[model samples]
Target: MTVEQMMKSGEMIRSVCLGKTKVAEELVNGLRESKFADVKELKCYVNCVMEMMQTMKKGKLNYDASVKQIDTIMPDELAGPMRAALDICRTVADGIKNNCDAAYVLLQCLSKNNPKFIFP
Candidate 1:
């Protein structure tokens, strides 16, 4: 679950999500099964998903804009989880370098904790 591995896995999931009709379900299920080593790891995961959602639309990488767009399209049933994830992402954002690093960090976390389903 090194940074390189995380980047690879995150890229894989992002590719799958870009075309999945049931993407909301897939994302919720993936998050439900994912395990975080600690709060920092969880925060990184949140940021990773946020970045993917923004990039999926080929839009600017603004956090607030990304959250709004994601919320509009995200399924209602997953609202709670999405909110929690976004909150963590916000917190994590304040502490990290402004870049795409979180996505890779999160992929590493997920790889060690839940590698069977998404990146097997």
Candidate 2:
């Protein structure tokens, strides 16, 4: 399904970030459409997500804080998938610190959790 359809169907997280559906749509589209060859590129994209969530302020990614903020935006019934996505973001942030392979890990995790938004 398209992003619009995914939003309408409630399958994709409605507020992947705290605000701005259009911005989140663009970010997810970037993930779906692009290929990253290095840690820098992946970091750039993920950081955009973090910034929108307001979780990566001052260059720190606080997993617990991010999840708490995420919980406020997601409904309880659909919280599991959103929580999984947040976990992946945390892993991606950590993995990027030491290995470039984190990019692949991130793409895989995102694609798995939100196929409607992340799939090709």
Candidate 3:
């Protein structure tokens, strides 16, 4: 996605998690479309977004909760496919023990699966 698109897509997520993470605004905005290899707060910021959406559980992707989140946020026509897409990427969390790592991996997975994927 273009810089504008990426930033806009993550705007709400960044806004909410920014309040919770206290990470630099740069990190918050930068990692929306890109990511930091060794930034601790950035990863938790990602986790915070997931938690706020209640799409995560015990540091893992909870499919049911995620489905509801999709339904809640996505258009009816797109929600089904988005949920299916997430299912394909679900294993991205496997073997990830840290909550931050889990969130980051899932983020990467979704991005990889859909080049134009929008995160919130």
**The candidate that achieves the highest TM-score relative to the unseen native structure:** 3
- Tens digit per residue, CA lDDT, model 2, 51-112: 55455554555667756754655566555676777676665545355322443455555556
Cα distance off (Å), candidate 1, residue 50: 5.5
TM-score of the candidate numbered 1? 0.36
RMSD of each: 11.9, 8.1, 5.3
Scored by lDDT, model 3 comes in at 0.75
CA displacement after TM-score superposition, residue 56 of candidate 3 (Å): 0.9
Model 2 segments more than 4 A misplaced? 1-45, 57-60, 98-108, 114-120
Cα error, residue 32 of model 1, in Å, equals: 8.4
- Model 3: colliding residue pairs: none
Better of 2 and 3 by TM-score: 3
Give the per-residue lDDT of model 1 (tens digit) for 56-103. 122123456644643554455554455445444443333335343554
- The lDDT for every candidate, in the order shown, is 0.44, 0.50, 0.75
After best superposition, candidate 2 residue 2: deviation in angstroms?
A: 24
Error of 3 at 31 (Å): 3.7
Candidate 3 residue-wise lDDT, 70-108, digit = tens: 776666777767777688898889889999889888877
Clash count, one per candidate: 0, 0, 0
In candidate 1, position 59 carries an lDDT of 18
